[PDB]
Curated annotation (Swiss-Prot):
It comes from Homo sapiens (Human). The active site is at K70, S256 (nucleophile). Disulfide bonds join C6-C42, C16-C33, C112-C195, C154-C170, C167-C178, C228-C242. The record marks R1, Q10 as: Interaction with PspA. Poly-N-acetyllactosaminic carbohydrate moiety seems to be needed for TLR4 activation. This is Lactotransferrin. The record marks K207 as: Important for iron binding. The chain holds residues 23 to 346 of 710 of the full protein. Fe(3+) 1 binds at D57, Y89, Y189, H250. Residues 3-324 form the Transferrin-like domain.
Amino acid sequence: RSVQWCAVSQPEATKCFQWQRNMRRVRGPPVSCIKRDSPIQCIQAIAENRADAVTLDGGFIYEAGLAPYKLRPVAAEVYGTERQPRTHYYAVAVVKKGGSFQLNELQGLKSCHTGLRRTAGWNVPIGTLRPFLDWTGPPEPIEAAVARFFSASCVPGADKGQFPNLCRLCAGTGENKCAFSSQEPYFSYSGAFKCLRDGAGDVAFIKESTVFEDLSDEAERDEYELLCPDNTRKPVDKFKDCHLARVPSHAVVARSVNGKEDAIWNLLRQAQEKFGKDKSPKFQLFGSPSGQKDLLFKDSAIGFSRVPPRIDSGLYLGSGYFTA
Ligand SMILES: [Fe+3]
């Protein structure tokens, strides 16, 4: 009963079958592929024993750990470089150089977010910005307070009908507009950075590596800066002293009871050695096809680090903090 990986979209399922084929070719541990249409559908499938593993951003690790699911993080993604690896990242606010607006002066501007309920793209910035919002609190959806704070935004996964403003800057065509998938050009970290790069938004809520990885000409980095919580703007390489939060990396979650943790780890450990960073030219576990974003795992990540037993989502997440 090989590990059953859960894809949250068709392109992800396609990559999973490619991963599977390659594992077979190299005689490594097998990986089955189950296809679903959203992170919560994968979380449910796992809780239901219909799947075993799925990589999630912290905002979703939180949701996955709640009843009736109770999934726990078993393996964390590793970012940084081989010489300087790390299992954490920085939520940053990137802007075009030239402007004078600061973090406390975003009312009425345009924003680009990785996706609804994601760490760097939603939870941290919206949390940080709360003092500047006019949220009356529940039962009002915070999306309403946000849609009336920013004049227009691209928040992949937002309710187009209820909060049209949150999807207006999204580039997807037809029903793909504002999709929480690669169907939306402005989805995830790279998509949100593109939303800013293209000039659709004034600020992009992403991570520190995006700008360095997405510009094929290093000279273009000069066109960008970061909005610091102390209300100053600094170069994109100063993220350590200029970020909205430092948070633990995305992680593969599994069932807390009979979750097949040793199997999942053996699969990931081997998948990394054979198809990880600069390993096989035939398949890249951390690479996605043209126009697709972070299929299965974070594009350009470098490996995994096993999470010690009995650490639940709450405990895993407790390492993240926000500079409000
Ligand atoms: Fe994230």
